[PDB]
Amino acid sequence: TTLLHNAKAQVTTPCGASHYMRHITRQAESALQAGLKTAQSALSEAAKAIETIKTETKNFLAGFAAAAELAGQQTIVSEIKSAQVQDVNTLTAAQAVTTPGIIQVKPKLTIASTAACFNDDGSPVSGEPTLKFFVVSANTPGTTHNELLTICGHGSTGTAPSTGCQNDATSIGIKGGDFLKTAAVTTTRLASSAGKTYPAITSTTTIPNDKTLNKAVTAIRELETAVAALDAISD
Amino acid sequence: TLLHNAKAQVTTPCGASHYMRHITRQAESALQAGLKTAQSASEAAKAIETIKTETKNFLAGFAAAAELAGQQTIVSEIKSAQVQDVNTLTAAQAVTTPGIIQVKPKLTIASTAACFNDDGSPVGEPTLKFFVVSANTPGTTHNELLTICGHGSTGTAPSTGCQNDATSIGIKGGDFLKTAAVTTTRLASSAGKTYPAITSTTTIPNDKTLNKAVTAIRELETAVAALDAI
């Protein structure tokens, strides 16, 4: 039998989650090839093999596409989680509100120098199965001086917020920080009255959201049954 | 089998994701037909041999098209990211609790599956179009986006117009990202028909991610064509 899920994989990062999904597609492909080869060697048993492959193609390709789509989503999640507001040094308040010294909210991203989640040479960089995905939402700003994502006060113009903001509005800058908050969501397959099933993911205010994730997991489940039916050909 | 929706006008990231899914739906129909022919009945052996030799290229480009669809789905959601406007406040109270002026991240979260409605329906040489995001550029003087907002009157919304006046201070917000389209059109040359390399080194996704997927999509096109012959 073909093991779609990698037991020796510990998903702890978005890039890890994307490689786990790609592993599903690689394993799904091997099961399809073996079914194709079994029907090819039988050239009746070849008629029922081709029949099983054709009947399961819709379920196979829908879940294959869903695993790939989830790998794509996690790849973008792994890049966007780096989004930050940059610190800006304080400036005497009268000059901080107009040209040439206006204090700016500066977006910044950290862009991979390779294909995201991959090395330059092309290699990856990261019981019932568990599907784990990472999701983003708006970060929560601070609520007092010297906390993230706030206007930074200091008695001395020119001060870097990293050295400590004060309750002092003589000069003002910006203490930056992460624009997003990243969290994991998980669903662990379990035996159901008629087979196996994934509990729903709850994540209503994130990117991706749970409607997007649950739709894809449902299709991954159809890939798993399609692969099991494919393994039954050579068994 | 026509993998490419010729009558598609891709102008949004969600439209780009649906174009990618059209490719996968068309690719499926080519394999299904190829399997239906094989079901009928050495000819049966010929089809199987093809379907098998081309499965590797087929699933590689199929996965790349669906991967790109997943990437464009997130692009369509995060492109909503903004820094919120914050009303001005007397400067001495603006630097500490409880009035501290905050840089407030904000997203717009789809209430459905992104790029789909509740019912589940979607919301020449071919061209592949994708949308990418990059850091937005802040303004350089008062009342321009992504700057501290001065005003003479405390409690003033920045939409009233920021001034060269630091009596009260707030935040003039705006989009956190800029979103632009990248494209590549299949080109006839002595190399056959190939998609030119995209250059985009400062965006999410970047060109190395995109160019790798595009190369695989070209291999899908070649696989669908061989599947059509049988």
Author numbering:
A (entry chain A): 22 to 64, 94 to 176, 186 to 294
B (entry chain B): 23 to 63, 94 to 175, 186 to 292
Paper text:
Long-term immune evasion by the African trypanosome is achieved through repetitive cycles of surface protein replacement with antigenically distinct versions of the dense Variant Surface Glycoprotein (VSG) coat. The mature VSG proteins are attached to the cell surface by a GPI-anchor, and consist of two main regions: (1) a large, N-terminal domain (NTD) of roughly 300–400 amino acids that is most distal to the membrane and (2) a smaller, membrane-proximal C-terminal domain (CTD) spanning 80–120 amino acids beneath the NTD that harbors the GPI-anchor. Therefore, at the heart of antigenic variation in the African trypanosome are the NTDs of the VSGs. These large subdomains are elongated folds centered on a three-helix bundle scaffold.
The structures of VSG21 and VSG545 were also determined, both harboring closely related folds and biochemical properties that distinguish them from other VSGs. Of note is the fact that both structures were obtained with proteolytic removal of the bottom lobe (contained in the C-terminal region of the NTD sequence). This cleavage occurred spontaneously during crystallization experiments performed with full-length VSG21 and the NTD of VSG545 that had been produced by limited proteolysis with Endoproteinase Lys-C (LysC). In contrast, for VSG21 and VSG545, the cleavage in the crystallization drops produced a truncated NTD missing the bottom lobe sequence but maintaining the 3-helix bundle and top lobe of the protein. No sugar is seen in the VSG21 electron density, and no predicted site for N-linked glycosylation (Asn-Xaa-Ser/Thr) was found in the sequence of the NTD. VSG21 and VSG545 are more similar to each other than these other VSGs, however, distinguished from them by the tightly twisted nature of the top lobe and, directly beneath it, the presence of a second three-stranded beta-sheet perpendicular to the axis of the 3-helix bundle. VSG21 and VSG545 align well to each other in the top lobe but not to the other VSGs with beta-sheet top lobes. Superpositions with predicted models from AlphaFold (which were accurate enough to solve the experimental structures by molecular replacement) show possible conformations of the full NTD for each protein. In this subdivision, we split the A3 class from Cross into A1b and A1c (which correspond to classes N5 and N3 in Weirather, respectively) based on differences in the top lobe architecture (e.g., the smaller top lobe beta-sandwich in A1c compared to A1b and the presence of a second beta-sheet over the middle lobe in A1c that is not present in A1b).
